[PDB]
Nucleic acid binder design. Structure first.
Ligand SMILES: [Zn+2]
Ligand SMILES: [Zn+2]
Lengths: 196, 205
DNA sequence: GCTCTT
């Protein structure tokens, strides 16, 4: 087992409510969003919101290249899932721990967060509460950076269904059919469940 | 023919000195500077400083789109020349007055300057003295926004030579070939000068 | 390196 850190990134969904003062250029960027599902996917595009998807997709892609830089380990396993949640759009990004010792993970993530604010919000701090948070272990004093097994993916992420499920990206060969396919997810979670 | 307003914009050239506290992302943006001269040009790249050029090019380009927005004149002629000057890099941006009455130019420029500080220096007020200045007329009570004739370009801008000359951009087809070509500049200024002095001499009856 | 955002 390699082990995964989980970072939850809230994705702004209301431009006035969440990105006060963003440029017109950003508005045009998200407003000209055309995403299509791949031919192998069985998801209803009609329940996938295009603007937050644009933002979340660039967010995760740039997060991952910055992670490869700071970890000195490209081809590092990852699984990112973008969801329409309780109150905010957010995505769970799971990255292999290799290359980043847990103690310094907080600081490296802060640096990545600042690069993202400069790159994809052009300097505007998003007004989302706790919008870029590594998930800790019992939220107590000091805490501890929780490390999840690969079994986190079938136990918690794959079972999500639309509209809560919005999108998903992955390095891992086990899950590339399952990212945008609901039936592949159902069969994979059932397989992991009976295998216990 | 319409005149030109001249705005002189100082371009920061020493990061910690002029943009104190700027993000590292800005540092990376300017340090990743590769500008190549077009093939028609006869300038020595080795005398063109790349980072201030990156800042200056974006500065003039965004000033120009903001100007077209403000003037409601999207085809307005311009001529921008970026130079390594007395003590700071700066650039003279000349824009056709059409679209902006002189009374309101001050405030429209104020707005453009704030937009530039926000979208380029990412909120950091540059510590350059008088860094965004419309040129006035005799500097007296109120001043008076000077309107320069197109002849300002050959009389004063084109004769510049490296390393003072750094870069140039133009709408005006009279000066396309001349922006980054020293010999075309020399020829154009020679043409203007002889034409003007000979037709002033012809004013002897 | 990126201020012309997959
Ligand atoms: Zn969730
Ligand atoms: Zn000068």
């Amino acid at each position: 087992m390699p082990g995964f850190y989980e970072i939850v990134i809230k994705v702004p969904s209301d431009l006035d409510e969440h990105l006060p003062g963003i440029s017109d250029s950003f508005v045009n960027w998200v407003a000209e969003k055309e995403w299509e599902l791949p031919p192998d996917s069985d998801m209803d595009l009609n329940l996938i919101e295009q603007a937050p998807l644009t933002v979340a997709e660039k967010l995760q892609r740039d997060f991952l290249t910055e992670w490869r830089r700071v970890s000195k380990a490209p081809e590092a396993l990852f699984f990112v899932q973008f969801e329409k949640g309780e109150s905010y759009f957010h995505m769970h990004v799971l990255v292999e721990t290799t290359g980043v010792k847990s103690m310094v993970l907080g600081r490296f993530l802060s640096q990545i967060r600042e690069k993202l604010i400069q790159r994809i919000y052009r300097g505007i701090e998003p007004t989302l509460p706790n919008w870029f948070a590594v998930t800790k272990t019992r939220n107590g004093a000091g805490g501890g950076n929780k490390v999840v097994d690969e079994s986190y993916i079938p136990n918690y992420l794959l079972p999500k269904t639309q509209p809560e499920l919005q999108w998903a990206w992955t390095n891992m060969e086990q899950y590339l059919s399952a990212c945008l396919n609901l039936t592949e997810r159902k069969r994979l979670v059932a397989q992991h469940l009976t295998h216990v």
